[PDB]
Amino acid sequence: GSHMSNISLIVGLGNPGSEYAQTRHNAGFWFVEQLADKYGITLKNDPKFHGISGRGNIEGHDVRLLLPMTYMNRSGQSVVPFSKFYQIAPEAILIAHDELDMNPGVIRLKTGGGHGGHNGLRDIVPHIGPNFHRLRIGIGHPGSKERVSGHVLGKAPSNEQSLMDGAIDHALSKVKLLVQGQVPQAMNQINAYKPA
């Protein structure tokens, strides 16, 4: 299975369907789809693990990509059995997700900690614990908890979308460090990203 903190599983969180593909809550899908295209990893139907998944070589490392197709609040129904079947320790998992607590154009690599109310991460941490890496893609916050639904299931305005796209692009350039186990350097270089 996995080997130390050499990231060998990259999960993108999101909802399935054309109606969610452009929503802020699908930021993780954007990252992983763009990473799959960057490295020529096929993302194929994986009914066994209720997702779409790939396997391929990233910079000389055998890496698996996973998009749960469970709906966001059931992400664990894909991530938990998939990571256990391939013996992937949480320390070798990167989960990319939308982060309400950061501005569009802000992106950070975080190791461990809480779901911070994220309904996707909420379905995962109870099973494998918190010690996986997260690519937190800033989406901004809508004010109140009643509006969180409408924000994350919203399609960002073009200014916000541009800022997220730039942050995601930046992050793609740092996956080489992550798959080589250089989490500290990758954290500094991702966290340092500014849009302008």
Side-chain angles (χ1 to χ4, degrees), residues 13-78:
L13 301 187
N15 285 311
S18 63
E19 75 269 35
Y20 294 107
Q22 308 177 46
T23 68
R24 296 183 173 108
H25 218 32
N26 267 41
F29 279 25
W30 305 337
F31 173 78
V32 167
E33 283 171 350
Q34 290 176 40
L35 180 63
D37 191 53
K38 182 180 171 68
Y39 285 99
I41 302 177
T42 299
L43 289 182
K44 64 199 183 289
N45 286 346
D46 195 354
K48 181 171 179 166
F49 298 112
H50 312 282
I52 292 164
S53 73
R55 185 186 177 195
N57 193 309
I58 298 186
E59 307 287 356
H61 294 78
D62 184 38
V63 175
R64 289 179 187 275
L65 306 183
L66 176 65
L67 307 175
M69 287 303 131
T70 51
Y71 292 93
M72 180 70 84
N73 55 38
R74 294 181 158 223
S75 293
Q77 310 210 34
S78 170

Short mmCIF file of all heavy atoms in Angstrom, two decimals, residues 13-78:
data_model
loop_
_atom_site.label_atom_id
_atom_site.label_comp_id
_atom_site.label_asym_id
_atom_site.label_seq_id
_atom_site.Cartn_x
_atom_site.Cartn_y
_atom_site.Cartn_z
N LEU A 13 -13.11 16.24 -3.49
CA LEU A 13 -14.48 16.20 -2.96
C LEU A 13 -15.41 17.05 -3.82
O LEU A 13 -15.00 18.09 -4.40
CB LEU A 13 -14.53 16.63 -1.50
CG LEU A 13 -13.69 15.84 -0.50
CD1 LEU A 13 -14.00 16.30 0.92
CD2 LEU A 13 -13.92 14.33 -0.59
N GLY A 14 -16.65 16.60 -3.92
CA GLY A 14 -17.65 17.24 -4.79
C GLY A 14 -18.92 16.44 -4.89
O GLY A 14 -19.05 15.40 -4.21
N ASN A 15 -19.89 17.00 -5.60
CA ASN A 15 -21.16 16.33 -5.97
C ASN A 15 -21.09 15.87 -7.41
O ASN A 15 -20.48 16.50 -8.26
CB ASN A 15 -22.31 17.30 -5.66
CG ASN A 15 -22.56 17.37 -4.17
OD1 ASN A 15 -22.67 16.31 -3.53
ND2 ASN A 15 -22.62 18.57 -3.59
N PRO A 16 -21.76 14.74 -7.74
CA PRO A 16 -21.89 14.28 -9.11
C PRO A 16 -23.01 15.04 -9.85
O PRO A 16 -23.86 15.55 -9.19
CB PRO A 16 -22.31 12.82 -8.93
CG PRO A 16 -23.13 12.84 -7.66
CD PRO A 16 -22.45 13.87 -6.77
N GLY A 17 -22.92 15.12 -11.17
CA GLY A 17 -23.94 15.67 -12.08
C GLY A 17 -23.53 17.01 -12.68
O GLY A 17 -22.90 17.84 -12.00
N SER A 18 -23.96 17.26 -13.91
CA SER A 18 -23.78 18.56 -14.61
C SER A 18 -24.23 19.72 -13.72
O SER A 18 -23.65 20.81 -13.86
CB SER A 18 -24.50 18.57 -15.92
OG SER A 18 -25.91 18.43 -15.70
N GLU A 19 -25.24 19.53 -12.85
CA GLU A 19 -25.84 20.66 -12.09
C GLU A 19 -24.92 21.10 -10.92
O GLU A 19 -25.17 22.19 -10.37
CB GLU A 19 -27.27 20.33 -11.63
CG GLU A 19 -27.35 19.38 -10.46
CD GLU A 19 -27.46 17.91 -10.84
OE1 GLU A 19 -26.84 17.53 -11.86
OE2 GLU A 19 -28.17 17.15 -10.13
N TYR A 20 -23.88 20.34 -10.57
CA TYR A 20 -22.97 20.65 -9.44
C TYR A 20 -21.54 20.90 -9.92
O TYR A 20 -20.71 21.42 -9.18
CB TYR A 20 -22.95 19.49 -8.43
CG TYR A 20 -24.28 19.33 -7.75
CD1 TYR A 20 -25.12 18.27 -8.05
CD2 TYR A 20 -24.74 20.30 -6.88
CE1 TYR A 20 -26.36 18.15 -7.45
CE2 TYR A 20 -25.98 20.21 -6.28
CZ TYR A 20 -26.80 19.13 -6.58
OH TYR A 20 -28.02 19.04 -5.99
N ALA A 21 -21.25 20.56 -11.17
CA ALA A 21 -19.87 20.53 -11.67
C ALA A 21 -19.23 21.92 -11.53
O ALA A 21 -18.00 21.98 -11.34
CB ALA A 21 -19.87 20.05 -13.10
N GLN A 22 -20.00 22.99 -11.71
CA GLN A 22 -19.43 24.37 -11.66
C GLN A 22 -19.62 25.02 -10.29
O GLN A 22 -19.26 26.21 -10.17
CB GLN A 22 -20.04 25.24 -12.76
CG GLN A 22 -19.93 24.60 -14.14
CD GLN A 22 -20.61 25.44 -15.20
OE1 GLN A 22 -20.42 26.64 -15.26
NE2 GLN A 22 -21.44 24.81 -16.02
N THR A 23 -20.15 24.32 -9.30
CA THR A 23 -20.41 24.91 -7.96
C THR A 23 -19.13 24.89 -7.13
O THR A 23 -18.27 24.00 -7.30
CB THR A 23 -21.58 24.21 -7.23
OG1 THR A 23 -21.19 22.87 -6.88
CG2 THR A 23 -22.85 24.19 -8.05
N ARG A 24 -19.03 25.85 -6.21
CA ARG A 24 -17.90 26.04 -5.30
C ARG A 24 -17.63 24.75 -4.53
O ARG A 24 -16.49 24.41 -4.30
CB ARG A 24 -18.28 27.18 -4.36
CG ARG A 24 -18.46 28.53 -5.05
CD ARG A 24 -18.76 29.53 -3.97
NE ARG A 24 -18.80 30.90 -4.42
CZ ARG A 24 -19.90 31.63 -4.54
NH1 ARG A 24 -21.09 31.12 -4.26
NH2 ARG A 24 -19.80 32.89 -4.91
N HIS A 25 -18.66 23.98 -4.19
CA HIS A 25 -18.48 22.76 -3.36
C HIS A 25 -17.73 21.68 -4.13
O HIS A 25 -17.37 20.63 -3.53
CB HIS A 25 -19.85 22.27 -2.91
CG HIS A 25 -19.90 21.74 -1.53
ND1 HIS A 25 -19.10 22.20 -0.50
CD2 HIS A 25 -20.73 20.82 -1.01
CE1 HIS A 25 -19.42 21.54 0.58
NE2 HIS A 25 -20.43 20.71 0.30
N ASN A 26 -17.52 21.90 -5.44
CA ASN A 26 -16.85 20.96 -6.36
C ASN A 26 -15.39 21.38 -6.59
O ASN A 26 -14.73 20.79 -7.41
CB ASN A 26 -17.67 20.83 -7.65
CG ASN A 26 -18.64 19.68 -7.58
OD1 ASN A 26 -19.26 19.46 -6.53
ND2 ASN A 26 -18.69 18.91 -8.66
N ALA A 27 -14.87 22.33 -5.83
CA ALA A 27 -13.47 22.80 -5.98
C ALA A 27 -12.50 21.60 -5.99
O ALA A 27 -11.52 21.61 -6.74
CB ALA A 27 -13.16 23.78 -4.87
N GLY A 28 -12.74 20.60 -5.16
CA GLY A 28 -11.85 19.46 -5.07
C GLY A 28 -11.85 18.70 -6.37
O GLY A 28 -10.76 18.24 -6.77
N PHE A 29 -13.03 18.49 -6.97
CA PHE A 29 -13.18 17.86 -8.31
C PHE A 29 -12.39 18.68 -9.32
O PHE A 29 -11.66 18.09 -10.12
CB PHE A 29 -14.61 17.80 -8.82
CG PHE A 29 -15.45 16.67 -8.30
CD1 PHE A 29 -15.17 16.06 -7.08
CD2 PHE A 29 -16.58 16.29 -9.01
CE1 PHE A 29 -15.96 15.02 -6.62
CE2 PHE A 29 -17.38 15.25 -8.54
CZ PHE A 29 -17.08 14.64 -7.34
N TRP A 30 -12.48 20.02 -9.27
CA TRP A 30 -11.75 20.83 -10.27
C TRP A 30 -10.26 20.48 -10.17
O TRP A 30 -9.64 20.17 -11.18
CB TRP A 30 -11.95 22.32 -10.05
CG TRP A 30 -13.35 22.79 -10.01
CD1 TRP A 30 -14.45 22.19 -10.55
CD2 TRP A 30 -13.80 24.01 -9.40
NE1 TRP A 30 -15.55 22.94 -10.28
CE2 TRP A 30 -15.20 24.04 -9.55
CE3 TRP A 30 -13.16 25.02 -8.67
CZ2 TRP A 30 -15.98 25.07 -9.01
CZ3 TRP A 30 -13.93 26.04 -8.15
CH2 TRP A 30 -15.32 26.06 -8.31
N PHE A 31 -9.70 20.53 -8.97
CA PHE A 31 -8.27 20.26 -8.73
C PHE A 31 -7.93 18.87 -9.29
O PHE A 31 -7.00 18.70 -10.06
CB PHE A 31 -7.88 20.40 -7.26
CG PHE A 31 -6.47 19.96 -6.95
CD1 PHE A 31 -5.40 20.78 -7.25
CD2 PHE A 31 -6.21 18.76 -6.32
CE1 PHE A 31 -4.10 20.35 -7.02
CE2 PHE A 31 -4.92 18.39 -5.99
CZ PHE A 31 -3.86 19.17 -6.36
N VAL A 32 -8.69 17.85 -8.92
CA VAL A 32 -8.23 16.47 -9.22
C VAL A 32 -8.40 16.20 -10.73
O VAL A 32 -7.57 15.51 -11.31
CB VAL A 32 -8.94 15.46 -8.29
CG1 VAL A 32 -8.78 14.01 -8.71
CG2 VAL A 32 -8.43 15.63 -6.86
N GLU A 33 -9.40 16.82 -11.35
CA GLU A 33 -9.67 16.61 -12.79
C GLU A 33 -8.53 17.26 -13.55
O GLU A 33 -8.01 16.67 -14.50
CB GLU A 33 -11.04 17.17 -13.17
CG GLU A 33 -12.17 16.28 -12.74
CD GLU A 33 -13.53 16.95 -12.92
OE1 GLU A 33 -13.55 18.17 -13.20
OE2 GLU A 33 -14.55 16.28 -12.73
N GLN A 34 -8.14 18.45 -13.10
CA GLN A 34 -7.02 19.17 -13.74
C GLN A 34 -5.70 18.42 -13.48
O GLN A 34 -4.89 18.39 -14.40
CB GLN A 34 -7.03 20.60 -13.25
CG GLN A 34 -8.21 21.36 -13.79
CD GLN A 34 -8.28 22.75 -13.22
OE1 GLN A 34 -7.26 23.44 -13.06
NE2 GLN A 34 -9.49 23.17 -12.88
N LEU A 35 -5.55 17.75 -12.33
CA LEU A 35 -4.29 17.04 -12.01
C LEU A 35 -4.22 15.78 -12.88
O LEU A 35 -3.12 15.44 -13.34
CB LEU A 35 -4.25 16.66 -10.53
CG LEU A 35 -3.00 15.91 -10.08
CD1 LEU A 35 -1.76 16.78 -10.25
CD2 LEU A 35 -3.15 15.46 -8.64
N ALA A 36 -5.35 15.12 -13.06
CA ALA A 36 -5.46 13.91 -13.91
C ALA A 36 -5.09 14.27 -15.35
O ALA A 36 -4.31 13.52 -15.98
CB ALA A 36 -6.84 13.34 -13.85
N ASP A 37 -5.59 15.42 -15.85
CA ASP A 37 -5.28 15.82 -17.24
C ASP A 37 -3.80 16.19 -17.32
O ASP A 37 -3.13 15.86 -18.31
CB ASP A 37 -6.13 16.98 -17.75
CG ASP A 37 -5.93 17.14 -19.25
OD1 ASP A 37 -6.10 16.13 -19.99
OD2 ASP A 37 -5.57 18.21 -19.65
N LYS A 38 -3.31 16.90 -16.32
CA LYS A 38 -1.88 17.28 -16.31
C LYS A 38 -1.00 16.02 -16.47
O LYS A 38 -0.09 16.08 -17.32
CB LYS A 38 -1.57 18.07 -15.04
CG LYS A 38 -0.13 18.57 -14.95
CD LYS A 38 0.16 19.36 -13.69
CE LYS A 38 1.63 19.66 -13.49
NZ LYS A 38 2.13 20.60 -14.51
N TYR A 39 -1.25 14.93 -15.74
CA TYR A 39 -0.32 13.76 -15.70
C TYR A 39 -0.81 12.60 -16.56
O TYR A 39 -0.16 11.56 -16.50
CB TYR A 39 -0.07 13.32 -14.27
CG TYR A 39 0.85 14.26 -13.55
CD1 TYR A 39 0.36 15.25 -12.71
CD2 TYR A 39 2.20 14.19 -13.79
CE1 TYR A 39 1.23 16.12 -12.07
CE2 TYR A 39 3.08 15.07 -13.19
CZ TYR A 39 2.59 16.03 -12.32
OH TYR A 39 3.44 16.86 -11.69
N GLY A 40 -1.90 12.77 -17.30
CA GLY A 40 -2.40 11.73 -18.21
C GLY A 40 -2.90 10.53 -17.44
O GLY A 40 -2.71 9.41 -17.91
N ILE A 41 -3.50 10.77 -16.26
CA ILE A 41 -4.18 9.72 -15.45
C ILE A 41 -5.64 9.66 -15.93
O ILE A 41 -6.38 10.64 -15.80
CB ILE A 41 -4.04 10.00 -13.95
CG1 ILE A 41 -2.56 10.08 -13.54
CG2 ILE A 41 -4.80 8.98 -13.12
CD1 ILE A 41 -2.31 10.42 -12.09
N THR A 42 -6.05 8.53 -16.48
CA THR A 42 -7.46 8.24 -16.83
C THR A 42 -8.32 8.21 -15.56
O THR A 42 -7.98 7.44 -14.62
CB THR A 42 -7.61 6.88 -17.52
OG1 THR A 42 -6.82 7.01 -18.71
CG2 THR A 42 -9.05 6.55 -17.84
N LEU A 43 -9.43 8.96 -15.57
CA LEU A 43 -10.42 8.92 -14.45
C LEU A 43 -11.61 8.10 -14.91
O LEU A 43 -12.37 8.60 -15.77
CB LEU A 43 -10.84 10.34 -14.07
CG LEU A 43 -9.79 11.18 -13.35
CD1 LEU A 43 -10.36 12.54 -13.00
CD2 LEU A 43 -9.26 10.48 -12.12
N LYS A 44 -11.74 6.87 -14.41
CA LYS A 44 -12.73 5.92 -14.98
C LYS A 44 -13.73 5.48 -13.91
O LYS A 44 -13.54 5.73 -12.70
CB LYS A 44 -12.02 4.76 -15.66
CG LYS A 44 -11.19 3.87 -14.74
CD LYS A 44 -10.16 3.02 -15.47
CE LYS A 44 -9.39 2.09 -14.54
NZ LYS A 44 -8.45 2.83 -13.65
N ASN A 45 -14.84 4.97 -14.40
CA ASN A 45 -16.01 4.54 -13.63
C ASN A 45 -15.49 3.49 -12.65
O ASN A 45 -14.78 2.59 -13.12
CB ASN A 45 -17.16 4.08 -14.53
CG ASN A 45 -17.86 5.23 -15.22
OD1 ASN A 45 -17.69 6.40 -14.85
ND2 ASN A 45 -18.65 4.94 -16.24
N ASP A 46 -15.74 3.68 -11.36
CA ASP A 46 -15.30 2.78 -10.27
C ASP A 46 -16.51 2.48 -9.39
O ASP A 46 -16.61 2.93 -8.25
CB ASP A 46 -14.08 3.34 -9.53
CG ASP A 46 -13.34 2.34 -8.64
OD1 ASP A 46 -13.83 1.18 -8.49
OD2 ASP A 46 -12.26 2.74 -8.12
N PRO A 47 -17.50 1.74 -9.91
CA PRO A 47 -18.69 1.43 -9.13
C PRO A 47 -18.38 0.75 -7.80
O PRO A 47 -19.10 1.01 -6.87
CB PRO A 47 -19.50 0.47 -10.01
CG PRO A 47 -18.52 0.04 -11.09
CD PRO A 47 -17.62 1.24 -11.29
N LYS A 48 -17.37 -0.14 -7.76
CA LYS A 48 -16.99 -0.85 -6.52
C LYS A 48 -16.82 0.15 -5.37
O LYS A 48 -17.26 -0.17 -4.25
CB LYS A 48 -15.71 -1.68 -6.64
CG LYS A 48 -15.37 -2.40 -5.34
CD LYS A 48 -14.26 -3.41 -5.39
CE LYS A 48 -14.04 -4.01 -4.02
NZ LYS A 48 -13.20 -5.24 -4.08
N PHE A 49 -16.20 1.32 -5.62
CA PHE A 49 -15.88 2.30 -4.55
C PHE A 49 -16.76 3.55 -4.69
O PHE A 49 -16.37 4.59 -4.13
CB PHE A 49 -14.37 2.56 -4.52
CG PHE A 49 -13.53 1.34 -4.20
CD1 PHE A 49 -12.70 0.75 -5.14
CD2 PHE A 49 -13.61 0.76 -2.95
CE1 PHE A 49 -11.99 -0.41 -4.84
CE2 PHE A 49 -12.85 -0.35 -2.62
CZ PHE A 49 -12.05 -0.95 -3.57
N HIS A 50 -17.91 3.43 -5.38
CA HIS A 50 -18.91 4.51 -5.56
C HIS A 50 -18.20 5.79 -6.01
O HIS A 50 -18.41 6.85 -5.39
CB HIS A 50 -19.68 4.74 -4.25
CG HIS A 50 -20.16 3.45 -3.67
ND1 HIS A 50 -21.27 2.81 -4.18
CD2 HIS A 50 -19.66 2.65 -2.70
CE1 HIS A 50 -21.46 1.68 -3.52
NE2 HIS A 50 -20.48 1.56 -2.59
N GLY A 51 -17.33 5.68 -7.00
CA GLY A 51 -16.64 6.86 -7.51
C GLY A 51 -16.12 6.74 -8.91
O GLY A 51 -16.41 5.78 -9.65
N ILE A 52 -15.40 7.76 -9.30
CA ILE A 52 -14.56 7.71 -10.51
C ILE A 52 -13.13 7.75 -10.00
O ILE A 52 -12.86 8.51 -9.03
CB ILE A 52 -14.95 8.90 -11.42
CG1 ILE A 52 -16.37 8.72 -11.98
CG2 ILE A 52 -13.91 9.10 -12.50
CD1 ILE A 52 -16.97 9.98 -12.58
N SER A 53 -12.26 6.90 -10.52
CA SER A 53 -10.89 6.75 -9.99
C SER A 53 -9.90 6.53 -11.13
O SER A 53 -10.29 6.09 -12.26
CB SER A 53 -10.80 5.65 -8.96
OG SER A 53 -10.91 4.36 -9.56
N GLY A 54 -8.66 6.85 -10.82
CA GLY A 54 -7.54 6.64 -11.73
C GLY A 54 -6.34 6.15 -10.97
O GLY A 54 -6.25 6.27 -9.71
N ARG A 55 -5.41 5.67 -11.76
CA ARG A 55 -4.09 5.26 -11.29
C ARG A 55 -3.11 5.63 -12.38
O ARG A 55 -3.37 5.37 -13.61
CB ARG A 55 -4.05 3.77 -11.02
CG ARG A 55 -2.71 3.35 -10.44
CD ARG A 55 -2.70 1.86 -10.34
NE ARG A 55 -1.43 1.39 -9.86
CZ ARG A 55 -1.05 0.11 -9.95
NH1 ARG A 55 -1.83 -0.80 -10.52
NH2 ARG A 55 0.14 -0.24 -9.49
N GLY A 56 -2.00 6.23 -11.97
CA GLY A 56 -0.90 6.43 -12.92
C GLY A 56 0.32 6.96 -12.24
O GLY A 56 0.33 7.09 -10.98
N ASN A 57 1.28 7.33 -13.06
CA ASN A 57 2.61 7.79 -12.64
C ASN A 57 2.56 9.30 -12.53
O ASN A 57 2.20 9.96 -13.50
CB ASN A 57 3.64 7.26 -13.64
CG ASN A 57 5.09 7.36 -13.21
OD1 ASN A 57 5.55 8.42 -12.80
ND2 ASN A 57 5.84 6.28 -13.36
N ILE A 58 2.85 9.82 -11.35
CA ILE A 58 3.14 11.27 -11.18
C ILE A 58 4.59 11.38 -10.75
O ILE A 58 4.90 10.94 -9.66
CB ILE A 58 2.19 11.92 -10.17
CG1 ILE A 58 0.75 11.82 -10.67
CG2 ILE A 58 2.60 13.34 -9.88
CD1 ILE A 58 -0.25 12.54 -9.82
N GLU A 59 5.40 12.00 -11.61
CA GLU A 59 6.83 12.24 -11.33
C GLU A 59 7.51 10.99 -10.74
O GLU A 59 8.25 11.16 -9.74
CB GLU A 59 6.93 13.39 -10.33
CG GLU A 59 6.17 14.62 -10.80
CD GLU A 59 6.79 15.41 -11.93
OE1 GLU A 59 7.94 15.08 -12.38
OE2 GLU A 59 6.08 16.36 -12.39
N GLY A 60 7.28 9.80 -11.32
CA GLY A 60 8.00 8.57 -10.94
C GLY A 60 7.36 7.85 -9.77
O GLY A 60 7.98 6.93 -9.25
N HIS A 61 6.15 8.26 -9.36
CA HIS A 61 5.40 7.64 -8.24
C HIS A 61 4.06 7.10 -8.75
O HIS A 61 3.36 7.82 -9.48
CB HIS A 61 5.21 8.62 -7.08
CG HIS A 61 6.49 8.98 -6.42
ND1 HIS A 61 7.35 9.90 -6.97
CD2 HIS A 61 7.11 8.52 -5.31
CE1 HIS A 61 8.42 10.01 -6.21
NE2 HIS A 61 8.30 9.20 -5.18
N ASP A 62 3.70 5.90 -8.30
CA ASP A 62 2.39 5.25 -8.56
C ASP A 62 1.34 5.91 -7.64
O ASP A 62 1.41 5.73 -6.40
CB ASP A 62 2.58 3.74 -8.39
CG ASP A 62 1.37 2.89 -8.69
OD1 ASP A 62 0.66 3.23 -9.64
OD2 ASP A 62 1.20 1.86 -7.97
N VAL A 63 0.42 6.69 -8.22
CA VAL A 63 -0.57 7.51 -7.46
C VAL A 63 -1.99 7.18 -7.90
O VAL A 63 -2.20 6.96 -9.08
CB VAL A 63 -0.28 9.01 -7.63
CG1 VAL A 63 -1.32 9.89 -6.99
CG2 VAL A 63 1.11 9.33 -7.12
N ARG A 64 -2.92 7.11 -6.96
CA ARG A 64 -4.35 6.88 -7.26
C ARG A 64 -5.12 8.19 -7.08
O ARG A 64 -4.84 8.97 -6.08
CB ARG A 64 -4.86 5.73 -6.38
CG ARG A 64 -4.32 4.38 -6.79
CD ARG A 64 -4.82 3.28 -5.89
NE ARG A 64 -4.15 2.03 -6.21
CZ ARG A 64 -4.50 1.18 -7.14
NH1 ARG A 64 -5.55 1.42 -7.93
NH2 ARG A 64 -3.78 0.06 -7.28
N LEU A 65 -6.08 8.43 -7.96
CA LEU A 65 -6.95 9.63 -7.90
C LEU A 65 -8.37 9.16 -7.66
O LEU A 65 -8.75 8.15 -8.27
CB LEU A 65 -6.88 10.44 -9.20
CG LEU A 65 -5.49 10.86 -9.64
CD1 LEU A 65 -5.55 11.72 -10.88
CD2 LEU A 65 -4.76 11.59 -8.55
N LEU A 66 -9.11 9.86 -6.81
CA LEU A 66 -10.48 9.40 -6.47
C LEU A 66 -11.40 10.62 -6.39
O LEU A 66 -11.08 11.58 -5.65
CB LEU A 66 -10.42 8.61 -5.15
CG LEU A 66 -11.79 8.17 -4.63
CD1 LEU A 66 -12.41 7.18 -5.59
CD2 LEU A 66 -11.74 7.63 -3.21
N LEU A 67 -12.49 10.55 -7.14
CA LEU A 67 -13.65 11.46 -7.00
C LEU A 67 -14.81 10.62 -6.50
O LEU A 67 -15.36 9.85 -7.27
CB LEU A 67 -13.99 12.06 -8.36
CG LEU A 67 -12.83 12.71 -9.09
CD1 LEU A 67 -13.29 13.15 -10.47
CD2 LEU A 67 -12.27 13.88 -8.31
N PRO A 68 -15.22 10.76 -5.23
CA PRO A 68 -16.43 10.09 -4.75
C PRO A 68 -17.67 10.50 -5.56
O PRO A 68 -17.79 11.66 -5.88
CB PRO A 68 -16.58 10.59 -3.31
CG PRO A 68 -15.18 10.97 -2.93
CD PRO A 68 -14.60 11.59 -4.20
N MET A 69 -18.53 9.55 -5.89
CA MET A 69 -19.74 9.85 -6.71
C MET A 69 -20.96 9.56 -5.84
O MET A 69 -22.01 9.18 -6.37
CB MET A 69 -19.74 9.07 -8.02
CG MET A 69 -18.74 9.60 -9.01
SD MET A 69 -18.93 11.37 -9.45
CE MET A 69 -17.24 11.95 -9.24
N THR A 70 -20.80 9.80 -4.53
CA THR A 70 -21.69 9.36 -3.44
C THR A 70 -22.66 10.50 -3.06
O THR A 70 -23.57 10.25 -2.25
CB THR A 70 -20.88 9.04 -2.18
OG1 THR A 70 -20.05 10.21 -2.01
CG2 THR A 70 -20.03 7.79 -2.25
N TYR A 71 -22.41 11.70 -3.58
CA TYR A 71 -22.81 13.02 -3.04
C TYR A 71 -21.88 13.34 -1.87
O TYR A 71 -21.35 12.46 -1.19
CB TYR A 71 -24.33 13.14 -2.74
CG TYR A 71 -25.18 13.12 -3.98
CD1 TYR A 71 -25.72 11.94 -4.48
CD2 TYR A 71 -25.38 14.28 -4.73
CE1 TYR A 71 -26.43 11.92 -5.67
CE2 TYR A 71 -26.09 14.27 -5.91
CZ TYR A 71 -26.62 13.08 -6.39
OH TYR A 71 -27.31 13.07 -7.57
N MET A 72 -21.66 14.63 -1.67
CA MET A 72 -20.64 15.19 -0.76
C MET A 72 -20.80 14.61 0.66
O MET A 72 -19.80 14.13 1.20
CB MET A 72 -20.75 16.71 -0.70
CG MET A 72 -19.70 17.23 0.22
SD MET A 72 -18.00 17.07 -0.46
CE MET A 72 -17.85 18.53 -1.49
N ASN A 73 -22.01 14.61 1.24
CA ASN A 73 -22.21 14.21 2.66
C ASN A 73 -22.00 12.71 2.86
O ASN A 73 -22.14 12.26 4.03
CB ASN A 73 -23.60 14.57 3.20
CG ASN A 73 -24.72 14.02 2.36
OD1 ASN A 73 -24.64 12.90 1.85
ND2 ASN A 73 -25.74 14.84 2.14
N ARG A 74 -21.75 11.96 1.78
CA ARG A 74 -21.51 10.50 1.86
C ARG A 74 -20.12 10.14 1.31
O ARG A 74 -19.84 8.96 1.12
CB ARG A 74 -22.61 9.75 1.11
CG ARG A 74 -23.99 9.89 1.73
CD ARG A 74 -24.97 9.09 0.90
NE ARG A 74 -26.14 8.75 1.67
CZ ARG A 74 -26.74 7.56 1.67
NH1 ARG A 74 -26.27 6.55 0.96
NH2 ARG A 74 -27.83 7.40 2.42
N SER A 75 -19.27 11.14 1.09
CA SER A 75 -17.90 10.96 0.55
C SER A 75 -17.18 9.77 1.21
O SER A 75 -16.38 9.17 0.54
CB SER A 75 -17.13 12.23 0.71
OG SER A 75 -17.68 13.24 -0.12
N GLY A 76 -17.36 9.53 2.51
CA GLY A 76 -16.66 8.47 3.27
C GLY A 76 -17.01 7.10 2.74
O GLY A 76 -16.21 6.17 2.88
N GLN A 77 -18.20 6.97 2.18
CA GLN A 77 -18.67 5.67 1.61
C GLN A 77 -17.78 5.27 0.42
O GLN A 77 -17.78 4.11 0.06
CB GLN A 77 -20.16 5.79 1.32
CG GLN A 77 -20.90 6.32 2.55
CD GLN A 77 -22.33 5.89 2.77
OE1 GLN A 77 -22.73 4.76 2.46
NE2 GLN A 77 -23.10 6.76 3.40
N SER A 78 -17.04 6.20 -0.18
CA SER A 78 -16.08 5.95 -1.27
C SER A 78 -14.66 5.97 -0.68
O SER A 78 -13.91 5.03 -0.84
CB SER A 78 -16.27 6.95 -2.38
OG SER A 78 -15.24 6.90 -3.34
#
